[PDB]
Design a protein around this ligand. Structure first.
Ligand SMILES: Cc1ncc(COP(=O)(O)O)c(CN[C@@](C)(CCC(=O)O)C(=O)O)c1O
Lengths: 360, 360
């Protein structure tokens, strides 16, 4: 078997893919593909609603939150948030503690003067993040934005926000959503591209608190306008029908396997197994504090970088794909999302030990 | 067999879909799906480049035009064009002659004060469009916008633009591109959502003349910024990888079948067959002038609208799906894109005659 450690687009559940394949040309006895069906037809509309319903059950999303499905991916959202919830304030709080947290800030500059807070710190030579109670927010700010899971850095902030009514929290859960249960009520906006932990590329999920709607800037393209999307049930224009369909299958696969509570347990074992191998070895090394170690994305450097190529050739031949670290960082990176079975994180750890043994 | 006359998402070539199905879980002997592979990997990048190359060969797109692949669909473009090529001007020419031509104007209002030209005219009781030589353009206008093929109205403007080298033409080819050969050099911008005549929903193709780049409004979200997309090879952020892949298969299917010249030849005999049945019958009727009849979308009303329901039940049982007209116009509508074979069109005309001979 092959185990894909790509970070996005990512590996999808084998069952989900085995089904999509089978009914690719004859979905629902219709004799056509879901891709060929009109988005307005009752057949698809049922898929779309069921999709949202399952999603709400999974995260316990309360009635006062709208769940939208749009184009653009995560970066489209770096623009959408400012365009939608900035209202008429001229600033917003942005917490930088990683590559993605920073990218969001760069886009935000187009629409306002963002107050940046550098939450990055180094403790015991290990990369960590300042606790929320130490974050500097401003008074005038329309909202505060931050990223709970840096895909490149392997940094995670699991702390639950506790700023109080006055503050609106916007977060980028692209690479962590559905990995652990979260209290949605603490947030104002939660967005996430599907290509990492949900489904395929092309679709993006957004969770907005209803009272935040109706403030959109006139300049906001209608396809990004939260109010427009909500009023049309995420069907203002033709949506990524196939992507929405697969997401639906994934959501079902999740409920079928115990929901996010069970996923959280499994994700915990997978992370511990891997991080256990890295810490106990001299050959491999991760430089992130225990308190901030992501369970989704795990970057690691080799003691001898001259072996990087050989590690990649041998890991690939062993059926372990996409282990190369991000471009701007080098090293290695194993992304172990919900779809990645513990059995797979084991195959990787088995290989890593065997490599260290005969090359280390 | 089943013949899907949906107007978007539309029917895809049977070969293209068979293939996509076969290698759904093991694409390129990789043992993974194209959906699970990263867009930064060499495997996909080769698909993406090959995709663009085939597309350029098909339409003979000269070196001074960039070909972009983005999110948002056609309605994302109603915003993108104004945001990108409006430059430092405050007004643009917009030619209304249909639902889509009008929708574009509606979005444009967000970014400027558009000069609208009503090209709609009724000749002999038949709906027609004023010839381009009679179109009123303004002096200060940053560009002129129009839609050569109204999907809902069944109106088509095949006339080749010939205004001043000073005039910049932007067009919405969503439902007609690749149906007949066109002289790209006449246009400044050509955009089109893939769900109609190319591939699946989620992807959008744009053809921009290079000298038009670098004018983008600061407010334009980066994912829509033509310059940003060009600089990153349409890979600024994760793109709709599966959609891009299918489009590639379609482009190959086209070259394999004779290119746009052969398609034009077949599309002509599909249109003539159908319009021949409608004109020669008293039961069915299309009210569009021969000079403006779309060969892609063919709307038709029944003489007795009380039979609409029965026409739909019987046509569906006969394996002819999605024949219902649009909500706004009512009636019926057969969309016969490139993927729709002549055998499929004949099957429809055979049915229409039979139905008449039994209820008319
Ligand atoms: C000619 C044309 N331009 C733009 C669009 C909008 O496409 P997206 O919704 O942004 O992908 C379309 C769409 N035509 C549809 C599919 C509209 C259906 C609907 O009610 O939304 C059609 O069936 O005509 C164009 O045709």
């Amino acid at each position: 078997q092959i185990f894909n450690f790509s970070s996005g687009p990512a590996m999808l559940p084998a069952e989900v893919l085995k089904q999509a394949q089978q009914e690719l040309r004859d979905w629902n006895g219709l004799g056509t593909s879901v891709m060929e069906v009109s988005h307005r037809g009752k057949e698809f509309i049922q898929v779309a609603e069921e999709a949202e319903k399952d999603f709400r059950d999974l995260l316990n999303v309360p009635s006062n939150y709208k769940v939208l499905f749009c184009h653009g991916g995560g970066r489209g959202q770096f623009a959408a948030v400012p365009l939608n919830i900035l209202g008429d304030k001229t600033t917003a709080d942005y917490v930088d503690a990683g590559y993605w947290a920073a990218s969001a800030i760069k886009e935000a500059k187009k629409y306002c003067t963002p107050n940046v807070f550098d939450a990055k710190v180094t403790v015991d030579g290990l990369r960590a993040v300042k606790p929320m109670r130490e974050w500097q927010l401003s008074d005038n700010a329309a909202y505060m934005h931050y990223c709970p899971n840096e895909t490149i850095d392997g940094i995670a902030i699991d702390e639950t926000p506790d700023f109080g009514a006055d503050v609106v929290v916007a977060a980028d859960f692209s690479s962590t959503i559905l990995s652990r249960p979260i209290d949605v009520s603490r947030y104002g906006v939660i967005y996430a591209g599907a290509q990492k932990n949900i489904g395929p590329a092309g679709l993006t999920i957004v969770i907005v608190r209803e009272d935040l709607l109706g403030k959109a800037n006139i300049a906001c393209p209608s396809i990004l306008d939260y109010s427009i999307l909500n009023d049309n049930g995420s069907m203002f224009n033709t949506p990524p029908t196939f992507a929405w369909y697969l997401s639906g299958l994934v959501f079902k696969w999740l409920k079928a396997n115990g929901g996010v509570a069970e996923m959280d347990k499994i994700n915990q074992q997978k992370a511990e197994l891997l991080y256990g191998v890295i810490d106990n070895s001299d050959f491999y090394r991760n430089d992130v504090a225990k308190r901030n170690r992501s369970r989704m994305n795990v970057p690691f450097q080799l003691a001898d970088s001259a072996l990087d190529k050989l590690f990649l050739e041998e890991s690939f031949a062993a059926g372990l794909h996409a282990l190369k670290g991000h471009r701007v960082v080098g090293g290695m990176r194993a992304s172990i999302y919900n779809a990645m079975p513990l059995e797979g994180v084991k195959a990787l750890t088995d290989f890593m030990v065997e490599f260290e043994r005969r090359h280390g």
